[PDB]
Write a protein that binds this ligand. Structure first.
Ligand code: NA
Length: 309
């Protein structure tokens, strides 16, 4: 019923100005009911761990990162996932131009194909970061808003959904804003479920295309030579000419590519340089990290090979 006079909620966010303004925004902008929203938020928990985690050579650095993902068990499970969802994977390739090895690599690195999807209630993580974390409160408040709208539309109970300490969800660990901007109903059931492997596959593919993935284009090409003078990383940008002058030569032809990022991997015995192409940068659009993108790519290649035999 109404309860117009029950204006103050209990719980961890009871006397929080940010939580109050947020309820006002949801009611005002999306037609949410203040009392219904207060009941939900009165159950939300302020998690210290979420706050602590958000507060964040050659020595073989890449080798250590790589072995976290590329192991016999992971490659074998990757083969099983690929075979199980081969039609969806092929359909995503045809529709979005994103190859199975990239989608398999992303879902493998993110959740080991649905095995590790997160144990934290999304509501708690998002409320905590929205109401008790000034540094990124605006970003997370936006995620919480979208999360509550997602739950309303996919008919989920907001308190039942679990995920990462930052509110990432399902097979591909999509943030609420990614669900909003990039998730698709790939299964064809009329719904968008981040926990449905077919929807997740299509959604990851759409995210990639949206971020500029070029179908059939090379991701990166290993270089012969060393370029210690030049700054490196996925954000760098050099003409092929400058890289050549630096002492590098590509192991594979670079087609019409005239520029590339200079990637450097620490392989213990030394440094391994690569010419980063646009598609490599597109992978970093999922997680801003050279190591992450290289692991996603190589895990997918490893699985593709293991499938052959
Ligand atoms: Na669906």
């Amino acid at each position: 019923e109404p309860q117009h006079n029950v204006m103050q909620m209990g719980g961890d966010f009871a006397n929080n100005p940010n939580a109050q303004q947020f309820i006002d925004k949801m009611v005002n902008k999306h037609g949410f009911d203040r009392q219904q929203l207060q009941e939900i938020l009165s159950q939300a928990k302020r998690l210290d761990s979420v706050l602590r985690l958000m507060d964040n050579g050659p020595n073989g650095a890449w080798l250590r990162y790589r072995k976290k993902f590329i192991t016999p068990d992971n490659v074998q499970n990757g083969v099983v996932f690929w075979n199980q969802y081969e039609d969806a994977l092929n359909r995503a390739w045809q529709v979005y131009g994103v190859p199975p090895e990239i989608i398999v690599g992303i879902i493998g690195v993110e959740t080991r194909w649905g095995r590790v999807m997160g144990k934290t209630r999304i509501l708690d993580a998002l409320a905590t970061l929205s109401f008790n974390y000034p540094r990124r409160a605006e970003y997370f408040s936006g995620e919480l808003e979208t999360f509550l709208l997602m739950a309303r539309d996919e008919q989920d109970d907001p308190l039942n959904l679990k995920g990462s300490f930052a509110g990432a969800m399902g097979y591909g660990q999509f943030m609420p804003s990614s669900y909003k901007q990039y998730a698709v109903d790939f299964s064809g059931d009329g719904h968008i479920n981040l926990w449905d492997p077919v929807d997740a596959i299509g959604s990851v593919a759409n995210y990639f295309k949206a971020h500029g993935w070029v179908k059939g284009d090379q991701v990166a090409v290993m270089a012969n030579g060393q370029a210690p003078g030049l700054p490196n990383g996925f954000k760098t940008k050099y003409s092929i000419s400058q890289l050549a002058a630096a002492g590098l030569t590509p192991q594979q032809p670079l087609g019409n590519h005239q520029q590339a990022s200079l990637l450097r991997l620490d392989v213990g015995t030394g440094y391994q340089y690569w010419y980063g192409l646009p598609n490599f940068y597109t992978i970093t659009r999922y997680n801003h990290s050279t190591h992450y993108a290289m692991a996603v790519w190589q895990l997918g290649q490893a699985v593709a090979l293991a499938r052959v035999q």
